Design a binder for this molecule. Sequence first.
Ligand SMILES: NC(=O)c1ccc[n+]([C@@H]2O[C@H](COP(=O)([O-])OP(=O)(O)OC[C@H]3O[C@@H](n4cnc5c(N)ncnc54)[C@H](O)[C@@H]3O)[C@@H](O)[C@H]2O)c1
Ligand SMILES: NC(=O)c1ccc[n+]([C@@H]2O[C@H](COP(=O)([O-])OP(=O)(O)OC[C@H]3O[C@@H](n4cnc5c(N)ncnc54)[C@H](O)[C@@H]3O)[C@@H](O)[C@H]2O)c1
Ligand SMILES: O=C(O)[C@@H]1CCCCN1
Ligand SMILES: O=C(O)[C@@H]1CCCCN1
Lengths: 355, 346
Amino acid sequence: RGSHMETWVLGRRDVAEVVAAVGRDELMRRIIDRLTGGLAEIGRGERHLSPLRGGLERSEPVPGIWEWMPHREPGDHITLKTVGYSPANPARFGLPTILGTVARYDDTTGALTALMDGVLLTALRTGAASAVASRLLARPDSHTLGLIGTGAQAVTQLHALSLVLPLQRALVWDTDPAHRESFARRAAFTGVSVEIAEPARIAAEADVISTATSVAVGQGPVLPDTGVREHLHINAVGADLVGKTELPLGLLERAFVTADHPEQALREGECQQLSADRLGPQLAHLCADPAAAAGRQDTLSVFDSTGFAFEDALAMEVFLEAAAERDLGIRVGIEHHPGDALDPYALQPLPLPLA
Amino acid sequence: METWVLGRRDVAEVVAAVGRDELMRRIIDRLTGGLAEIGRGERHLSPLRGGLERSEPVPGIWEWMPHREPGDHITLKTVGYSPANPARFGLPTILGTVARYDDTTGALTALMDGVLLTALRTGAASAVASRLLARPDSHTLGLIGTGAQAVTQLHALSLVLPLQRALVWDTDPAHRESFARRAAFTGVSVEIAEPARIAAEADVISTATSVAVGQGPVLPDTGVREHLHINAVGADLVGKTELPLGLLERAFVTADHPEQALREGECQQLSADRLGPQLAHLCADPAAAAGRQDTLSVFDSTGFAFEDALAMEVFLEAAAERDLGIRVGIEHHPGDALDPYALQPL
Ligand SMILES: NC(=O)c1ccc[n+]([C@@H]2O[C@H](COP(=O)([O-])OP(=O)(O)OC[C@H]3O[C@@H](n4cnc5c(N)ncnc54)[C@H](O)[C@@H]3O)[C@@H](O)[C@H]2O)c1
Ligand SMILES: NC(=O)c1ccc[n+]([C@@H]2O[C@H](COP(=O)([O-])OP(=O)(O)OC[C@H]3O[C@@H](n4cnc5c(N)ncnc54)[C@H](O)[C@@H]3O)[C@@H](O)[C@H]2O)c1
Ligand SMILES: O=C(O)[C@@H]1CCCCN1
Ligand SMILES: O=C(O)[C@@H]1CCCCN1
């Protein structure tokens, strides 16, 4: 009837090809630009924040969560990221803590049209979001980045931030000695000099900090409440379980705090520690009217990052566009579309080879 | 390492390898056993499902349906209800897929079609309820709505009851016209008949319509047989019902998922205290249904992810039997877990 629909699958080999072909820096800039425009759209009321996401707490081996994150563009498509936070992963299985995929469904028919790896895309859009926030809230001559947690997100935090700020040094800490010791290797491609530094030194020297740890519920802060530079900006990225926090309450209460997604942040971000009156205007507001950020670069600021599906949808479109140009991915007929729409058993087998 | 994907050609090859009747029976058996586990408190009903409403071209909804087995895997069905699909697009109303993820690590280990699977487990669920609640000598099936679910309703029921004929109705003439062809494989003779006649003559009815919210009922309260059992299958949007209230109030009603049915099924029209035991309890203790076969009964079917997990497991086993499917490395598992740009050869 209509032309046969199939699901366009970009797995790990194609996603690697997009990175090699576009270039890491260009790909990240594309994501930054698309996020910036989309957040400003939300800030103008032209689009909406994603609905709250849902999830299943897992107790074992270590407390974790598996979430589904929908975003609908009415009449167009529905994006659904499915993603696990499993922080025993790298230590028990050799896997990323964050493992997921992103799928797109036609909003008109419901058909699954595309499916791709969520691991790299997640890391990219999360670094991008910190870059968006830091352009607005970090001093534009920031030279020193601090990183607490030097696992996966840390790599793209450094990368994104190195594209928007004149970073000269990264001072880095992880409670796992092997993970902080390998960071420099992982960070080499950015050109930014790396030094292992304890949290107190990070707090004392950084212009900009990103916290992105797997700290357990009840076990923060990961950055001690000591001396910070007056203009410090922090991207508080770590987040999973209710009860999981990274920053000291005291520090938050001296900061201009902006959430990506306030309803979410107030339940599972750093803002879970705060009453709502202690939040400034949300990131989308700042994107749409950057004058709202006036004077905030020069005093303490916190971006409370939690992640939401709109970010995944935008990043996925960047990937799909680049994959379309470069002829990447496979086409798989996953859904059964019977030749008679009213007959579940109108099934077509694999054609016979020509003998 | 990789994701095992079973597509449209592979599910065709499953049905051929197993046989339509046998595959249905396999699903009926797994569902019976699984429901009984729930009825004994050994497994739990899936959590309430989520959804996004869609207004164009006609009202529908797209839903996500999770089921966790703590420690093995998480099943997620993603499924649309888009009742203009057949007439506008030549696509099924119900269009979905079912994915399996490892509970421990979160990885995506399998992905398959949800269209056949949904039709089969939904037929199966009615067969489960009907074996308990229809007269065992039922010979006449009634169908209101003769779209895709009606096919597997007839099929599954034909396997647990000695059906000789089906009396059928659809508000779309072209859809009631084609039913006999879609049903012919079962050997059950088909006759088109108005809803009042189906109500008077059927031993067992399944309602599975894409009726709009507030436009029920699809079966009139016009006189029924004493022993009638109804599988009330249709549902999607809150405010959608198929049965007349007067009939529900006189019935022994069992729900697949009571909490869900009270919100989205026929049990929307009832209070919790009026329901009989849930279907899981009846499967755990069939003796609890004694005598209900001979009086008016309704199974309020809404669909829940546990049924999809169980059906998916049947497909996976059959496909493993025959090395069916492809394996695709979708997820980027960097050898270096801490490097999202560690991609990936050689
Ligand atoms: N958009 C978002 O805001 C977003 C997106 C992706 C991930 N995340 C979250 O960011 C966090 C990090 O993810 P990841 O992929 O980098 O995980 P990872 O497991 O790759 O890295 C986490 C690092 O934190 C270290 N760590 C644990 N406790 C610490 C402490 N007290 N101080 C310093 N280091 C500590 C671990 O040793 C590990 O190396 C998680 O909480 C995750 O859910 C958020
Ligand atoms: N487990 C469950 O209970 C479960 C599972 C799958 C589908 N469903 C539901 O079953 C319903 C049918 O799904 P389908 O896949 O067969 O859809 P379909 O579109 O193939 O068939 C529905 C049929 O209903 C007919 N119809 C509409 N209004 C009617 C009326 N007032 N009287 C008689 N016929 C009418 C249509 O003309 C169409 O032929 C949907 O609501 C769907 O969401 C339930
Ligand atoms: O938005 C994200 O992708 C992450 C997934 C893990 C939990 C928190 N946020
Ligand atoms: O359980 C199911 O698959 C169907 C999906 C559509 C809404 C009604 N229930």
